[PDB]
Symmetry: C2
Subunit: 213 residues, 2 copies
């Protein structure tokens, strides 16, 4: 029977280069951490190939094959299907810590797209990071203590995008007085799985550039 | 080891009565169709019990246990975790038909909440149902032909809510010139699994009533 497969976003105009999808990176982080043998198939969404449109006709990424031939979409769905089919090593996050940092990504996009300083977007984002800092100071170094879980593989890519896009477009960085957020991103981003699956800053910025204007 | 379990919304003030959650009904429809032995645990969200807040601390429904002790949320996640752990009988919808009727439910809520007739909400909903009718006329009686799949178990509850809430609050019904939508809802709603898991019209209307005003 079939191999384990994942289709993710490639850099625009470079089909052999990994793109900036943070939902695709969550799935890649899961597959790496569980030491599963798989194949990453890159798709340039501005030039959707024949084989891709067969597998995912609505052109959405990521799409995953567990080796059964049935292609499934949505990174929440995918990472949970992976947890069931490949339970060891466990990456289960306790439900008490499931929604930790849930509003950081929407607040990041809100502040990035912003043109007004009286917007309240910066404060709303800062308040969201202050809450994450408090949670990490109390129950860290990761979302669920001493070990990396699913919630980290989801939030990690989102904080990476926040870091690169806000520095480039705004000159804004997660403030250093948020010591627990910083130890968290320092620890998470330096992981063998993150370093491998992270997009080059270049493609992250290029991807966000049209949405900023 | 543990039993298969699902926590769903109960009628407000009646913990022994099945509530109106259409995402919970999708999961119940999946569990019935796959002839899986499970237990439905009812939760009155206006009076969240002790045991429930342990299992799902963010108070969200549905929540599901496949018998491993690990509670999971989101009906898209749940129904796909069920498809992997219990593949026979298959309920896989081909991805080509995955997004069929995707905008019907948001358009229904838009038109229900509406106070203006010049809103364009009615037409937007009608256009969405006309497209579903065309798809069903061409590739029916269900979303994926002759047999019921996952997409039907998702859309079915949504069309049921649309039917009951729009008749009660607006005097609006899916027009009868949409013959394929009607054969579809006639076939789907009469199924042993639907009849069993459907909320009483009463609790559907009561649930929507505060959101209409």
């Amino acid at each position: 029977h079939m191999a384990v497969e994942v289709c993710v976003k490639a850099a625009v105009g470079a089909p052999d280069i990994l793109g900036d999808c943070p939902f695709s990176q969550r799935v890649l982080l899961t597959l790496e951490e569980k030491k599963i043998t798989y194949e990453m198939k890159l798709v340039d969404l501005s030039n959707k190939p024949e084989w891709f449109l067969k597998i995912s006709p609505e052109g959405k990424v990521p799409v995953f094959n567990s080796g059964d031939g049935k292609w499934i979409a949505d990174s929440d769905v995918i990472t949970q299907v992976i947890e069931e089919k490949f339970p060891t090593p466990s990456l289960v996050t306790p439900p008490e810590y499931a929604s930790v940092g849930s509003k950081i990504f929407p607040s990041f996009v809100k502040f990035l797209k912003s043109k007004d300083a009286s917007d309240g977007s910066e404060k709303a984002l800062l308040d969201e990071l202050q809450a994450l800092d408090e949670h990490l100071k109390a129950h860290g170094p990761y979302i669920s203590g001493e070990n990396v879980s699913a919630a980290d593989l989801s939030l990690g890519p989102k904080l990476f995008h926040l870091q690169v896009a806000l520095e480039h477009f705004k000159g804004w960085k997660i403030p250093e007085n948020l010591t627990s957020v910083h130890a968290y991103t320092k620890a998470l981003f330096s992981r063998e799985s993150f370093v491998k699956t992270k997009p080059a800053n270049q493609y992250l910025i290029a991807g966000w550039a049209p949405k900023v204007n």
